[PDB]
Amino acid sequence: AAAXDXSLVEVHXXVFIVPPXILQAVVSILTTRXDDXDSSAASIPMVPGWVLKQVSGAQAGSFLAIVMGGGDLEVILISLAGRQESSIXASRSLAAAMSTTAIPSDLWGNXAXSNAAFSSXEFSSXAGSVPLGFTFXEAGAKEXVIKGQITXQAXAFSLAXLXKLISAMXNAXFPAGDXXXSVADIXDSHGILXXVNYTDAXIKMGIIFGSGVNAAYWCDSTXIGDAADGGXXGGAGXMXICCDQSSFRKAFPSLPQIXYLXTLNXXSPXAXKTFXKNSXAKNXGQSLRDVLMXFKXXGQXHXXXAXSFXAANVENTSYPAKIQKLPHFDLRXXXDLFXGDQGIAXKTXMKXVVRRXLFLIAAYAFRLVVCXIXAICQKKGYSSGHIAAXGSXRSYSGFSXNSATXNXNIYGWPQSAXXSKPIXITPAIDGXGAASXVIXSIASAXXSXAXXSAXXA
Numbered sequence: 383a384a385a386x387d388x389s390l391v392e393v394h395x396x397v398f399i400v401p402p403x404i405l406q407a408v409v410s411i412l413t414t415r416x417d418d419x420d421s422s423a424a425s426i427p428m429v430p431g432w433v434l435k436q437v438s439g440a441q442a443g444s445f446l447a448i449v450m451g452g453g454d455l456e457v458i459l460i461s462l463a464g465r466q467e468s469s470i471x472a473s474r475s476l477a478a479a480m481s482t483t484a485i486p487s488d489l490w491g492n493x494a495x496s497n498a499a500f501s502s503x504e505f506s507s508x509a510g511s512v513p514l515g516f517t518f519x520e521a522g523a524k525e526x527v528i529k530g531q532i533t534x535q536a537x538a539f540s541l542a543x544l545x546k547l548i549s550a551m552x553n554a555x556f557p558a559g560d561x562x563x564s565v566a567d568i569x570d571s572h573g574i575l576x577x578v579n580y581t582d583a584x585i586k587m588g589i590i591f592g593s594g595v596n597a598a599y600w601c602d603s604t605x606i607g608d609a610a611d612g613g614x615x616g617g618a619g620x621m622x623i624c625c626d627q628s629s630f631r632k633a634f635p636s637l638p639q640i641x642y643l644x645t646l647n648x649x650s651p652x653a654x655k656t657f658x659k660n661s662x663a664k665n666x667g668q669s670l671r672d673v674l675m676x677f678k679x680x681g682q683x684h685x686x687x688a689x690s691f692x693a694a695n696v697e698n699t700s701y702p703a704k705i706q707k708l709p710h711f712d713l714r715x716x717x718d719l720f721x722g723d724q725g726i727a728x729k730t731x732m733k734x735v736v737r738r739x740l741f742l743i744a745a746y747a748f749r750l751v752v753c754x755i756x757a758i759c760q761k762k763g764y765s766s767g768h769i770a771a772x773g774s775x776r777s778y779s780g781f782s783x784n785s786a787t788x789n790x791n792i793y794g795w796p797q798s799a800x801x802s803k804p805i806x807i808t809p810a811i812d813g814x815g816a817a818s819x820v821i822x823s824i825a826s827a828x829x830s831x832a833x834x835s836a837x838x839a
């Protein structure tokens with residue numbers, strides 16, 4: 383707007399501007415950290431998915447899948463057939479009071495009757511008995527696919543006595559009632575690599591850009607450190623990994639962690655998942671709020687104005703999103719927002735700063751966010767491929783285009799349009815649902831023809 387203001391704006395341009403050189407530096411220690419975690423030790427979990435097989439698109443049949451979080455349980459029935467799939471679903475809301483039940487039988491009892499309900503709805507007969515895939519985004523501890531132990535409750539549950547294998551926990555309540563078999567317990571990122579690969583052979587990774595961020599890809603058993611248990615395993619071929627890289631650089635030798643980012647760390651149930659904190663859009667409204675508050679204090683904006691704004695995480699992700707989507711010019715939509723929302727009255731020169739700031743903040747989450755994608759392709763040597771992306775942040779103003787060209791940056795591609803880029807980020811197929819059904823079909827057979835599903839016991 384005015385000189386004093388433009389100055390302050392260019393310095394925020396210095397703070398949130400992240401050049402390829404930085405991105406290249408980050409990507410480089412990312413390769414290494416990746417390696418680190420596949421080795422006998424390392425800070426990125428890099429937990430094997432136990433998906434030992436590619437997948438054809440020629441796999442057929444009826445498969446069950448569920449995923450539940452706080453709120454709902456999605457039960458999906460999916461119909462598989464020579465590279466296409468038909469899903470049908472239903473959701474059930476967690477009985478208020480579940481999450482904090484004293485009795486564990488309650489949770490499983492819940493998923494078993496919902497299951498009973500869906501089948502009775504869906505079949506009303508049926509003879510064979512169908513495999514089920516449980517996507518349990520919560521805590522590793524898969525020894526095998528058919529496994530799964532709660533490491534720690536996320537999503538805000540707290541149910542006494544579980545850090546057990548959640549699997550035996552649920553089937554039990556099945557027999558009791560009757561009809562299906564839990565053949566695989568998995569992660570949402572795995573699911574999207576898999577289901578997405580069944581429909582598109584060119585898929586090289588499965589990534590989520592939502593509240594949390596993570597990715598999955600296929601490594602190969604001989605390039606791992608798990609090599610000490612196997613036998614029936616092709617002796618060097620096809621192992622899916624759940625990176626759980628939202629923790630990269632908790633050591634901090636290389637993310638361009640600004641003062642705003644330190645603060646966000648601190649105020650968080652502290653000091654972890656720093657790659658997530660620096661590229662998760664879940665925190666982008668709070669990063670926006672901090673600079674804003676910082677300029678108020680230095681008396682450059684919101685002169686006079688009252689603050690109900692100085693409330694940690696008052697601004698969610700939808701605030702910069704909306705400010706970025708502001709179509710016209712005098713940024714009429716932001717003024718509306720700040721106003722009665724916060725009851726602030728800003729002039730258009732401020733709105734200009736608020737917008738330019740949302741701008742920086744979005745683009746850098748989008749840029750940093752692909753550093754672990756290009757790290758995989760490099761480490762695994764994928765010169766071309768498709769990255770199947772899922773997450774809420776992909777229905778965030780210009781995120782798709784941003785990471786895309788961030789990638790063109792890191793690599794150096796001189797290409798006009800995205801569609802022409804060697805590695806393209808495309809939308810995934812359903813990770814949580816179908817991906818979990820496609821992994822059961824894979825699983826089940828391995829069991830069937832008993833080929834082996836985990837580390838030698």
Ligand SMILES: Cc1ccccc1C(=O)N[C@@H]1[C@@H](O)[C@H](O)[C@@H](CO)O[C@@H]1O
Pocket residue numbers: 519520521522536569570571590592593594595596597626628655658
């Ligand atoms: C915080 C924590 C600690 C270690 C291992 C798992 C977690 C986690 O929830 N991480 C989840 C991850 O499992 C999931 O794939 C993504 C995308 O949905 O969201 C977070 O990153």
